[PDB]
RNA sequence: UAUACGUUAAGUGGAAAAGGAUGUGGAGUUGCUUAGACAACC
RNA sequence: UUUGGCACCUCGAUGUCGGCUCAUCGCAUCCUGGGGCUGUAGUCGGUCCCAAGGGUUGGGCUGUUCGCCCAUUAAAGCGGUACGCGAGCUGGGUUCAGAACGUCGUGAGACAGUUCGGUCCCUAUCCGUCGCGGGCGCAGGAAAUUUGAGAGGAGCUGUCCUU
RNA sequence: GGGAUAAGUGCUGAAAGCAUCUAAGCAUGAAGCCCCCCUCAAGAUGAGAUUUCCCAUUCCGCAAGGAAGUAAGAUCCCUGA
């Protein structure tokens, strides 16, 4: 459950360390985004020398959340943190590496490059 | 149209064959009995009157006993009509059983919503609170009653009052399982009302 | 209780 | 009305039955056509010559007079010769086809469009790209012809679509 | 359609007619279609 | 629910202007027309 | 709906900006539905007609209305209702007494100039609104099941795939 | 999904030999209108309908009315949700 002002760790090597959520995308009054949803966000903390710089507005896909996600079989997945991956408009990650486990839900939304790069998909 | 009366037992869940976990409501509907057929000639409209749930003799009265004589049945606790049914398909005294339905069939379920007693505008109409700080003395109140010009409040200014206890229909629920021996329908999802409350299960009107 | 009153200056 | 004053020749096999409220049934080789006319309009058949007599000279009657001749004139021509409007499909892959009673147009949509002609009207599909509505009632032939043209009416850039036979399309230029 | 208070012939092929109590112009040139309103 | 003769078809009557119009009633002037007009159709 | 003109109600008081809460109405329509014309190839548009059913975002700055900006959205409509709604809330501003700046004034002081601070009362009688009972009626007294005159509710819309 | 319509599109068609969606006649056509869907609803005094139950008591009265004890049935009171 990510909303305007939620800060997320960035689970990639794009240069951004922390982003602030500017907007949940996909409809007028949409309050909240979950795993596999895209957000507009500003980079609040960056790694020095990275591609993505502090202050850039960027799109990111959420790949883990504390709220987590329910599956049709009645099972759930939750993580210890909220994290996203900066993306281009075609869903490809701007970085080359993904850190930490991502949720299976990203396959469903056709974030395949992310799912392939992730060390674990739970 | 087809339909039956039962009691809401409660909720549980069932694994589907694909492994999906389906929440279900258990309705126990012992065989309903057709107590009366209303006809266009006599009554001005076609319907059957279903009785459900045998009542002790002490709890019956002579007018009730007489009304269920033609159907040759014990006095019934709940009596409802079904319109839209096939009149020729039913006879007075006929038992209507849960196996009229089958798994996968889409139904509408009707019952009385649980009672909540006297409730305010926040709970009853989903209104916003005023601020909780910044000097507010406006928390759970119902908002302006309206403009000055009419010198009166228009009808349908929503206010506190008794909430719940209303007839509610939920449309397009799926029968998950029919257990003919135990007289159970298992219906996907949740339906109006308290446990033990009378539920009417009908074939869906938008089918 | 107002500072000025109704239809203040 | 000049039109109302004009008499009309009835062929021998065109019976002209009358009834209450000047209701003229017209039998012939093709079929039967009934039409209730306006009460005041006067009508008479002598020596196989139907003539529409104008009762008054009010503009209301000046209108109904010419109309009543025209309709009877069409009712006669209907049962004798019959009417038919022609329709021409124009455009790549636009094709009509009869399918029992129904016309079936394939005119560039993602579904085929079907027209069921009512009792009396009949539709012929000589070419793949040509339709003909045949019938006795000139009104009712025109109606179905228009209903068919309405499916995909002639657009102005390349003239594509269902047109009437010998229809002038205002042809605009694209670029 | 031009909906305007002044319906007039724009060209020589324009016909002024009257339908359902409304003054209209009809023309081969569809730009010249006018209804009074 | 008068009488007589007219007008209106807009519920005009029962709120509005420049202006626009083959609405309809009454007058009147005038071009052309059985040496055949006007419309249609070589 | 503006700024005004007039000074007709109210000075033995008709609380006064903005916001909040709650709406409701108009249509001169912002979106969605239906169309005509196009200097409409297509995709987009422009312009006019019908249409008020429903819908019509969250932030930065400012007391602000407004506006500009960020990011969205199908869209981010315009207006009315005592500039809708303070016996419903707020009290930033405006609008008392303190103090100060610039300025004007010999001065006391003054300024829709600014600045920091500055008491928001009321147990609802009547109508009205939302709920809930009692009474009698409905040509006998009862227990159930009902018809529906009539009333309310709902009414939004995106994207992708396919063709 | 029906029904009827708005703008719009017409068909047939004269007034006005032609033309003309209109005057007679016949269509089509909107998230809109009336339905369809959900809820309340006979104090709808216009008080509706159906099924079933009780049964024509006693005493006052010239009757008109009145009183009493009851039937079917309900309630007081009580255990509660
Ligand atoms: K009037
Ligand atoms: K005053
Ligand atoms: K106050
Ligand atoms: K007041
Ligand atoms: K009062
Ligand atoms: K009643
Ligand atoms: Mg809120
Ligand atoms: Mg408080
Ligand atoms: Mg009043
Ligand atoms: Mg002009
Ligand atoms: Mg009027
Ligand atoms: Mg004066
Ligand atoms: Mg006073
Ligand atoms: Mg309008
Ligand atoms: Mg003002
Ligand atoms: Mg105000
Ligand atoms: Mg007030
Ligand atoms: Mg203040
Ligand atoms: Mg000085
Ligand atoms: Mg001042
Ligand atoms: Mg100054
Ligand atoms: Mg009704
Ligand atoms: Mg009754
Ligand atoms: Zn023209």
From Swiss-Prot, chain A:
Transmembrane segments: none annotated. InterPro entries: Ribosomal_uL14 (IPR000218), Ribosomal_uL14_bac-type (IPR005745), Ribosomal_uL14_CS (IPR019972), Ribosomal_uL14_sf (IPR036853). Keywords: Ribonucleoprotein, Ribosomal protein, RNA-binding, rRNA-binding. Pfam families: Ribosomal_L14 (PF00238). One of its GO terms (cellular component) is cytosolic large ribosomal subunit. One of its GO terms (biological process) is translation. The keyword RNA-binding applies. SUPFAM superfamilies: Ribosomal protein L14. One of its GO terms (molecular function) is structural constituent of ribosome. HAMAP family: Ribosomal_uL14. Belongs to the universal ribosomal protein uL14 family. Part of the 50S ribosomal subunit. Forms a cluster with proteins L3 and L19. In the 70S ribosome, L14 and L19 interact and together make contacts with the 16S rRNA in bridges B5 and B8. Binds to 23S rRNA. Forms part of two intersubunit bridges in the 70S ribosome. This is Large ribosomal subunit protein uL14. It comes from Bacillus subtilis (strain 168).
From Swiss-Prot, chain B:
GO terms for biological process: positive regulation of rRNA processing; rRNA processing; translation. Keywords: Ribonucleoprotein, Ribosomal protein, RNA-binding, rRNA processing, rRNA-binding. Pfam families: Ribosomal_L3 (PF00297). Gene3D superfamilies: 3.30.160.810, Translation factors. GO terms for molecular function: rRNA binding; structural constituent of ribosome. Residues 121-151 are annotated as: Disordered. Disulfide bonds: none annotated. GO terms for cellular component: cytosolic large ribosomal subunit. The keyword Metal-binding does not apply. One of the primary rRNA binding proteins, it binds directly near the 3'-end of the 23S rRNA, where it nucleates assembly of the 50S subunit. Strongly stimulates 23S rRNA precursor processing by mini-ribonuclease 3 (MrnC); 20-30% DMSO can replace L3, suggesting the protein may alter rRNA conformation. Part of the 50S ribosomal subunit. Forms a cluster with proteins L14 and L19. Interacts with RNA helicase CshA. PANTHER family: 50S RIBOSOMAL PROTEIN L3, LARGE RIBOSOMAL SUBUNIT PROTEIN UL3C. Belongs to the universal ribosomal protein uL3 family. This is Large ribosomal subunit protein uL3. It comes from Bacillus subtilis (strain 168).
Swiss-Prot record, chain D:
One of its GO terms (cellular component) is cytosolic large ribosomal subunit. It comes from the Bacteria. InterPro entries: Ribosomal_uL6-like, Ribosomal_uL6-like_a/b-dom_sf, Ribosomal_uL6_a/b-dom, Ribosomal_uL6_bac-type, Ribosomal_uL6_CS. GO terms for molecular function: rRNA binding; structural constituent of ribosome. Transmembrane segments: none annotated. SUPFAM superfamilies: Ribosomal protein L6. It holds the Pfam family Ribosomal_L6. PROSITE patterns: RIBOSOMAL_L6_1 (PS00525). GO terms for biological process: cytoplasmic translation. Keywords: Ribonucleoprotein, Ribosomal protein, RNA-binding, rRNA-binding. This protein binds to the 23S rRNA, and is important in its secondary structure. It is located near the subunit interface in the base of the L7/L12 stalk, and near the tRNA binding site of the peptidyltransferase center. Part of the 50S ribosomal subunit. Belongs to the universal ribosomal protein uL6 family. NCBIfam families: L6_bact. This is Large ribosomal subunit protein uL6. It comes from Bacillus subtilis (strain 168).
From Swiss-Prot, chain E:
One of its GO terms (cellular component) is ribonucleoprotein complex. It comes from the Bacteria. GO terms for biological process: translation. Part of the 50S ribosomal subunit. GO terms for molecular function: structural constituent of ribosome. Keywords: Ribonucleoprotein, Ribosomal protein. It comes from Bacillus subtilis (strain 168). Belongs to the bacterial ribosomal protein bL36 family. PROSITE patterns: RIBOSOMAL_L36 (PS00828). This is Large ribosomal subunit protein bL36. The gene is rpmJ.
